Design a protein around this ligand. Structure first.
Ligand code: BMB
Ligand code: ZN
Length: 103
């Protein structure tokens, strides 16, 4: 088990980073902090403390756990938290993501 950011290990620590999170963003800090994410200070850019995965451009209805599974399926935190079945389900829902983001 190897973490990327030991300082952002706890929920309380990640919550602290959302102090200056833009009020206009339609995703709530607690939902993002719970999915292992913390605010990186630029735009609406969040990173996972474990896999170092970065996400941005948060739209309304976006589920942080689904997005975590969608883009960073091998994250060991996402797996002990949500399980292989969930990760495999989301992966099945979006089976050509590389070719989705590659134009
Ligand atoms: C997260 C929710 C958002 N919207 C669902 C989304 O999926 N957003 C996506 C997203 O973020 N990412 C994926 C694809 C981009 C889209 C944005 C387009 N949404 C339009 C849309 C409209 C309608 C339907 C679907 C989608 C790739 C991984 C991540 C990302 O770009 N990370 C960057 C980053 C780095 C550092 C820190 C933070 C973030 C980064 C960028 C380039 C290289 C490396 C890392
Ligand atoms: Zn992760």
């Amino acid at each position: 088990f190897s973490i990327s950011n030991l300082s952002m290990q706890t929920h309380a620590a990640r919550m602290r980073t959302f102090m200056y999170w833009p009020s206009s963003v339609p995703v709530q800090p607690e939902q993002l902090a719970s999915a292992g994410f913390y605010y990186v200070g630029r735009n609406d850019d969040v990173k996972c403390f474990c896999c170092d995965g970065g996400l941005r451009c948060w739209e309304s209805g976006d589920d942080p756990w689904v997005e975590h599974a969608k883009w960073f399926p091998r994250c060991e935190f996402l797996i002990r938290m949500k399980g292989q079945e969930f990760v495999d389900e989301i992966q099945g829902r979006y089976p050509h993501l590389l070719e989705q983001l590659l134009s």
